[PDB]
Amino acid sequence: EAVANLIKRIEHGEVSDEEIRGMMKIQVQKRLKWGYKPTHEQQLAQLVTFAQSLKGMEMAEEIPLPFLHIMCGKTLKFSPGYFKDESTTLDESEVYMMDLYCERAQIKDGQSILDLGCGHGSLTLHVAQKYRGCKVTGITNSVSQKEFIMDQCKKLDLSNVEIILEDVTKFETEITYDRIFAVALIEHMKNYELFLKKVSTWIAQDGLLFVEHHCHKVFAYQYEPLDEDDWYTEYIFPSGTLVMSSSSILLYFQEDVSVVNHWTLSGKHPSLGFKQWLKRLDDNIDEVKEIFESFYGSKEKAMKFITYWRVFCIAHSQMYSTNNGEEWMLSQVLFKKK
Template sequence: MAAARAYLAATRAALAALERNLLPDAVTRRLTRLLLAQRLRLGYLPSAPLQLHHLLLFAHALEEMPIAIETDKAKDQHYELPTTFFKLVLGRNLKYSSCYFPDETSTLEDAEVAMLELYCERAQLQDGQTILDVGCGWGSLSLYIAKKYRKCSITGICNSTTQKTFIEEQCRENELSNVEIIVADISKFEMERSFDRIISIEMFEHMKNYKALLKKISRWMKEDSLLFVHYFCHKTFAYHFEDNNEDDWITRYFFTGGTMPSANLLLYFQDDVSIANHWLVSGTHYARTSEEWLKRMDNSIASIRPIFEKTYGKESATKWIAYWRTFFISVAELFGYNNGDEWMVAHFLFQKK
């Protein structure tokens, strides 16, 4: 009990220092690694049968949940910040998800394009197809496909009017007439159309009931359609992002209602789709991506501060600068842990059943 009280007091002191932007990065990284080690101790169970049993219980429990929870809060945490902030922090394509660094000399822009190319290859895209980009963000993939495959017709679904506005501006600037953007909550959205390819990049982590979600998506697939999914994951176990303790601030401020799936979790939801291929991408790529975002943020603090003052209020700008920096550090430490061999990215290719 005394140890728990001491830990709680230390956590509160660290968070108070963080809010004033007084916590050194080395301390933040060390604390993050300690929390990650604790998560691994909780996640790894004593035997393989017990590990599998726990994963199956998790998968079955998801089927009793809504497709998504707390969607408004999750949207506000990330996607209603002004695009000007993300232009300063992300790469040229505004890809707000893991990039892929072919070698040590690759820039963030190189890595964005490398991952976008990997999607095109693994999703087996061809010119002339109809493509649905579910959870399209700032349109990094939709716009990339529209430029690469001029005869493709791309429909993107995002949950933010700021994202839709940005993508439509990019379409006008690049004279692209083959992109349509819909603002919708995917958990409630319905339509009668069908597509040759459906792609979803880092959206499933915001979802819960994968059975219901995949059933919904399958209705938008033609008979010979393919579904490509990219999500981040842990290689062995799955868990919910829950705000239960003082140290759960990533959940509280950045990932409310989120899920950390396991690398194989979607394989338990093949009622309406069947797996055609499955890949893993080392977590080192995501770690490096987030380190690059952090560098860009640090290089643009003078421009970012007024954005945060307007968004969060003048008195809270310093706190939120510290929070966003710590978020990027935490992402880098998570995916870099154990040389990228604990938390990573999984790619799936599904056929319609």
């Protein structure tokens, strides 16, 4: 009704960025009041019941490279950076975070490395160049992502990268790997039990699996609108029904792997990154328009996608900033095979 009509106003510029923030603040408080319970007994039961529900699901149920070069940092990382102090640039945050992944996943030169859902190869190429004795295998289901990475290997003279074009949920191999990364991938999964069971078979003897997931600190939820006045949910997530995990949810999925270590990082880090994405978009908006008009085939369709990404950045920067980054945040889990 108005949920369709309010959007078009935003796309015309009738809604300022601060009004967008004010709207998402309303969305945030409704989600938080929905998720929190007055007793720990109820709060825990809500989580366990949610985790059990994922076990009755399937394991799981496009963006122009020139645009990603503008919005994302130099490594095209499609996942948060680590900000030491916001003199930290977007480019610096990508490297800081990937070195943190390497430290926490206990990467050693010479190991075989598997990067599941490698995207445009930020971590695949980071590890391959930093540890030249490693063999790094990335898996992506995107032809253009694989082609970009293989082209980077040429420009960078890398001989130790292989990219496999597959659906991770259907992939099968007899090969095992010393280290497996899944950075911002379980966000696209539903039955974590089946996902971790399959991945576990790929872990070599004494190997490790490192997972980073966006989450809320306490509770988990499917992206379903909260009431009639909720537009964010189906605007940002039009199709499918994905899951926002909680920081502790993977602790309940240790049938085939066991937790070695578990960390969280404050929502400040993803918030600062989304702010940088928006700034880069805005500072180059004319070039963004030409890229999108060429790819999407018209001015109006180009500006709908531009509005999407701006709202995406503004809304998620507000969400992750909530209460000094102590609501939505990042969870990193290190697993060994079990």
